[PDB]
Design a protein around this ligand. Structure first.
Ligand SMILES: CCN(CC)CCC[C@@H](C)Nc1ccnc2cc(Cl)ccc12
Lengths: 81, 78
C-alpha cells in the first residue's frame, strides 16, 4: 500500500545517497552548507545555534549514516516498518 | 541527479500516504518521538517537546509544498 511505497522509495533514495557520498566528492559539502543556510528560517537567535550544531556534528552524523543499511536508516526516520 | 528524483518520488508517495492513510501522520510523529530516547536522559524530553511543537507546522508546510520544493528545501534537489 501507500505506506509500503514510501518505505521502498526511502530505501532507493538512501541507497543512492550512500553511492553519492562514496562517488561524488562535493555531495556532502553541498548538502551540509545548504542545511546551514536553512537554519536562517528558525529565527535571529536560533539560526546561530542551529549553524553551530550542524558544523559540530555533520561529519559524525554522515559517518554514522554510512555504516547503516538503507532499510535501517529508513526504519530510524519512520518511513520503514 | 538520482537522489533528487528519488526524493521527488518519495515525497509524492508521502503526500499520497497522508491523503489516503488516516493513521500515517500519527504513526510517523509517535515513532520520531520514540527515537528521541536514543539521545539518552535530559536530551530525550527536549527532543520530544521539539517534535510536539513543530510537527503540525512541518506536516502542514510539507502538505502545501510541491515534492520538488520540499526536496530543494532539504537539499536533495537543485
Ligand atoms: C539517532 C542516532 N543515530 C544517528 C543517526 C544513531 C543510529 C543508531 C541505530 C539506530 N542504527 C543501527 C545501526 C546498526 N545496526 C542497527 C540494527 C538495528 Cl535492529 C537497528 C538499528 C541499527
Amino acid at each position: 500500500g501507500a505506506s509500503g511505497d514510501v518505505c521502498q522509495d526511502c530505501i532507493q533514495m538512501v541507497t543512492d545517497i550512500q553511492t553519492a557520498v562514496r562517488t561524488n566528492s562535493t555531495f556532502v559539502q553541498a548538502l551540509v552548507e545548504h542545511v546551514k543556510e536553512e537554519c536562517d528560517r528558525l529565527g535571529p537567535g536560533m539560526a546561530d545555534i542551529c549553524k553551530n550544531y550542524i558544523s559540530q556534528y555533520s561529519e559524525i552524523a554522515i559517518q554514522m549514516m554510512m555504516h547503516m543499511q538503507p532499510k535501517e536508516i529508513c526504519a530510524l526516520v519512520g518511513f520503514c516498518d
